[PDB]
Amino acid sequence: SNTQTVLPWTGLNTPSGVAVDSAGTVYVTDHGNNRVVKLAAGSNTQTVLPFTGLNTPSGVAVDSAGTVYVTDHGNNRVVKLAAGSNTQTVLPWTGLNTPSGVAVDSAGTVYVTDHGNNRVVKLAAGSNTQTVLPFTGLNTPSGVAVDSAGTVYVTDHGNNRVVKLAAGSNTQTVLPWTGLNTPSGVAVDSAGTVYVTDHGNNRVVKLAAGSNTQTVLPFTGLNTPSGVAVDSAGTVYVTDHGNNRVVKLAA
């Protein structure tokens, strides 16, 4: 598709992050209202998830079980809420300063970019052992994604680059993403295409696996795109921060 759709949310303010589950439900960190909102596919009526005491949440992810993970930036913590529950769980991150993004893989491992500590950390499901991913040269990592192979993708906001790290590997690859400025969000689809939100150029770009040739996605009227998600159908969802809206673009 060539023309974007504005999702029927109400009362958003400076939305910071977006996730989408297998059922097409869309989840948004309504950063300016200190809450997390949820929208079923083909619904015009959001619901507010019963998190407690959030403060300018920066990012969101959802796993196969429908559990929702939120980087509660203002409180230096990451919380999760299982589907149907009213009790949030504070994850056992230690030494976590300012979480800027969160991703969860199919095995339930959680990945968090720590903006204030210039690093990316992960929590294995069940084990709850934090480890620091051996990225090198980072500078205020702003978002994170994980593909089905376990490759971790980080937007290295300070160095205008996207870097990836193969699972258990010691090889970090800079994506040959020409013209990138201040990347702020990342997502990866099942074909390994990478989607990045770019503040400097105020746009959303994508890069196919094994490609030097980006596409600028034809969104329109964006003011600071802040988060991005891609569903199994290839629909691209973007939080339009400066416009208090969430836009999407079918494949």
229-to-53, 90, 93 alpha-carbon distances in Å: 25, 24, 24
State the structure-solving technique: X-ray
What structural domains and CATH numbers belong to the chain? 1-251 (2.120.10.30)
Give me 244's structure tokens. Answer: 């208090």
| Alpha-carbon 61 to chain mean position | 7
In sequence order, which residues have a C-beta less than 8 Å from that of residue 143 and are 6 or more positions away?
Answer: 59, 100, 101, 113, 154, 155, 183, 184, 185, 186, 227
- CA-nearest of 141, 75, 56, 48 to 102 is 141
Among 210, 19, 44, smallest CA distance to 27 is for: 19
CA 139 to chain centre: 18
> 247: buried, middle or exposed (CB in 10 Å: 19+, 13-18, 0-12)?
buried
CA distance 131 to 189: 25
Q: Cα(89)–Cα(206) distance, rounded to whole angstroms? A: 34
Burial of 251 (0-12, 13-18, 19+ CB in 10 A): exposed
- Could you say which DSSP state residue 170 is in? -
